[PDB]
Ligand binder design. Structure first.
Ligand SMILES: Cc1ccc2cc(-c3c(C)ccc(C(=O)c4c(-c5ccccc5)n(C)n(-c5ccccc5)c4=O)c3N)ccc2n1
Length: 259
């Protein structure tokens, strides 16, 4: 049996694993580029298989600067494996980026807003296509080699903190679930943590609209935005288009910014 993956790619390293999958960095032999390749073992459940096959077809249609870039998808039956070849991001994701910036000086307003705008625009792209993310969190947000923000479903398991209340309670939901996730991410970008204990305590309070007093005073506009985004009632949350048009996102600049 000839394995498509082993014939066409030189394996470099394992990047991690999560859910049905394992992810590898591998060099394509013919084109000489390095790719991220997710190998998903298809489950012994027809409805879960149905979903997986739908999801791969749906991602193959997607093209946006803030969405992870697709190359190929294929099946191998040596257990059936689905391989998905995407553009290789940097190893450190948004979660790691925030854990390496634990002071207020390292979270300058315009830098965080620039990053948040990229995420929000990726989300708005999905919503405009009648899609949603459902699982938006910092560990699902990576960077390209040139620091362009990339949203995907990375599935590297090393959390329900960013999940809307309607999902946590297992109720039906709408694209508005992603707006709830964005609210928490915006807060987290602007508010650096020293310990994981502090992070969990504070983010839990923020979910319930309890804010650190020094955050409300420093960032009054962003405070209002986060409140609205974190409404318990999904209807009350603003559309992604209304967030990206907010005044705080105009003329964003910082020393070192591209172009
Ligand atoms: C450094 C590094 C580490 C891991 C990486 C993983 C990926 C990656 C790979 C290799 C494959 C797929 C994705 C991805 O984002 C996925 C996406 C996805 C989600 C939103 C936007 C774009 C893609 N989907 C839907 N699915 C999916 C496929 C089948 C079943 C369920 C989910 C995904 O796996 C994905 N993020 C890409 C680059 C990586 N770079």
């Amino acid at each position: 049996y000839i394995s498509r993956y082993l014939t066409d790619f030189e394996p470099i390293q394992c990047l991690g694993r999560g859910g049905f999958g394992v992810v590898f960095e591998a060099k394509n032999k013919v084109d000489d580029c390095n790719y991220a390749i997710k190998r998903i073992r298809l489950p012994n459940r027809e409805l879960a298989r149905e979903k997986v096959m739908r999801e791969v077809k749906a991602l193959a249609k997607l093209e946006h600067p803030g969405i992870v870039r697709y190359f190929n998808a294929w099946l191998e039956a040596p257990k059936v494996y689905l391989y998905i070849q995407m553009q290789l991001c940097r190893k450190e994701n948004l979660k790691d980026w925030m854990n390496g910036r634990c002071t207020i000086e390292e979270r300058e307003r315009s830098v965080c807003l620039h990053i948040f705008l990229q995420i929000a625009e990726a989300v708005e792209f999905l919503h405009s296509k009648g899609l949603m993310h459902r699982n938006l969190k910092p560990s699902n947000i990576f960077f390209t080699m040139d620091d362009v923000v990339k949203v995907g479903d990375f599935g590297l398991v090393t959390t329900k903190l960013y999940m809307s209340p309607e999902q946590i309670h297992g109720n039906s939901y709408s694209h508005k679930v992603d707006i709830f996730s964005l609210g928490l991410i915006l807060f987290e970008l602007l508010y650096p943590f020293s310990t994981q204990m502090e992070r969990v305590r504070t983010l839990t309070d923020v979910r319930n609209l309890k804010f650190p007093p020094l955050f409300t005073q420093k960032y009054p506009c962003e405070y209002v935005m986060v409140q609205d985004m974190l409404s318990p009632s999904p209807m009350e949350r603003p559309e992604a288009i209304n967030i990206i048009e907010n005044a705080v996102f105009e003329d964003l600049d910082f020393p070192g910014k591209t172009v």
